[PDB]
Design a protein around this ligand. Structure first.
Ligand SMILES: N[C@@H](Cn1cc(Cl)c(=O)[nH]c1=O)C(=O)O
Ligand SMILES: N[C@@H](Cn1cc(Cl)c(=O)[nH]c1=O)C(=O)O
Ligand SMILES: [Zn+2]
Ligand SMILES: [Zn+2]
Lengths: 258, 258
């Protein structure tokens, strides 16, 4: 009767509170999705316990084993009742789980160290002085893999034979590599994260150009779950009341340092 | 076995072809949603006939009669099998029909005649020299009605006792009233339409400020329809292939006159 809510450690969605080591249960965490879970759980009238995904992944299906991993895997095999996180809505996933209507809108984008002579994906693909990559094992990576557009077809061929490995294990690791590499590495990541990093000290990065595509994040439940319909209406309710906007302001911009 | 596809006359989604009066069936029309219907019908493998909604409305429920009107009404009473149009995803509607994941992202916005001293909704609400309104009987109107935010709570109180009537019967009628009124009338409309009008002669209007909210358009089917799942996957497929973006470019910007 207590719902398991799977999520992922990723600022500023879910983070350890300043004195987390001295608390317990849901009180250890704070962030955008901690609040969202609270508001949803309040319209749907349920008790819940937040739970961090063991492998830290979003959700992909192994081509040989055909097992699903990450948060998606937790719903498919029945270990979690709902996922509340920055999980992208895609065709492959929608075949195996359900999504609510988007609670956030976004697209792929470019992050550079201030001063780098880059304005577009066309600028990146036509040179090799500057190396670039993506988070691993996510929808961003997958996007370049499956592209039939010329410029992106060019970029993925570079990233393919990149030495050393151009991908990263974490968003944090990417940003760090941008900050350390003195403008010789650029990072391709979702614009929600790009926009957040930009308002954080040391204030040395920035988003350049427009977005590569359009998409959204959804709250997910296993196929045929009874919580699916109540969760969708709840999301639409919060959007219509200005709660969603109020929450982005709180965690992105009301605490901006630059 | 031939699917009825309800839609609405609204540029540049659906329009009469240059010589429509000399054609028949689906050949009379052209636009963004005519193409979209074609691509969806091709992945879902069906034959279809486009049909223009009799009353020209989007979809609202009469508070005394409790009958639903517009395109929404056509699905609820079973006269159409699917709707393909700029129909906004809302909580009230989602209770009575189904929506696919959004094929377009947008929000409420401000249209002015070039030269008008307005930059924001805050600028509008704090004065009466300049009159303003919205399309009637749609989600935009409804948004100001239900708002509990101070500035919008102020704006809807004006529009309420406006003399003469500040609302309009058509998008076209609003734009026209902006162009004719020498900067004494401003129009609040969805930004998709604002952006399109801006790239049309006489090139005398423009979008000012940021969007009031975030939302999307969806393709709709009656509750429990068997076409619901195939239509959703088809939309996600077209989005992932760059078809959606390709189509917005075609009807908005590849033919821009300004
Ligand atoms: N949202 C993604 C994960 N994800 C996240 C970031 Cl910040 C990114 O740059 N790329 C991603 O794939 C998904 O659901 O796989
Ligand atoms: N999308 C709306 C209709 N609609 C359209 C325009 Cl262009 C507008 O400015 N306001 C609206 O309500 C709905 O579905 O009711
Ligand atoms: Zn710690
Ligand atoms: Zn004619």
């Amino acid at each position: 009767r207590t719902i398991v809510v799977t999520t992922i450690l990723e600022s500023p969605y879910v983070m350890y509170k300043k004195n987390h080591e001295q608390l317990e249960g849901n009180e250890r965490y704070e962030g955008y999705c901690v609040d969202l879970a609270y508001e949803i759980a309040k319209h749907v009238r349920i008790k819940y316990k937040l739970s961090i995904v063991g492998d830290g992944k979003y959700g992909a299906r192994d081509p040989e084993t055909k097992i699903w991993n990450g948060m998606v895997g937790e719903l498919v095999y029945g270990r979690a009742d709902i996922a509340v996180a920055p999980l992208t809505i895609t065709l492959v996933r929608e075949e195996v789980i359900d999504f609510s209507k988007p609670f956030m809108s976004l697209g792929i984008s470019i992050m550079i160290k201030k001063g780098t002579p880059i304005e577009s994906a066309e600028d990146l693909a036509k040179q090799t002085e500057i190396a670039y990559g993506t988070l691993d094992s996510g929808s961003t990576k997958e996007f370049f893999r499956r592209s039939k557009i010329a410029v992106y077809e060019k970029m993925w061929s570079y990233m393919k034979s990149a030495e050393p490995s151009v991908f990263t294990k974490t968003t944090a690791d990417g940003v760090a590599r941008v900050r350390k590499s003195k403008g010789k590495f650029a990072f391709l990541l979702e614009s929600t994260m790009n926009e957040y990093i930009e308002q954080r000290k040391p204030c040395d990065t920035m988003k350049v150009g427009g977005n590569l595509d359009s998409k959204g994040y959804g709250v997910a439940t296993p196929k045929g779950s009874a919580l699916g319909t109540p969760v969708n209406l709840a999301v639409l309710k919060l959007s219509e009341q200005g709660i969603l906007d109020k929450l982005k302001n709180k965690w992105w911009y009301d605490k901006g340092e630059c």
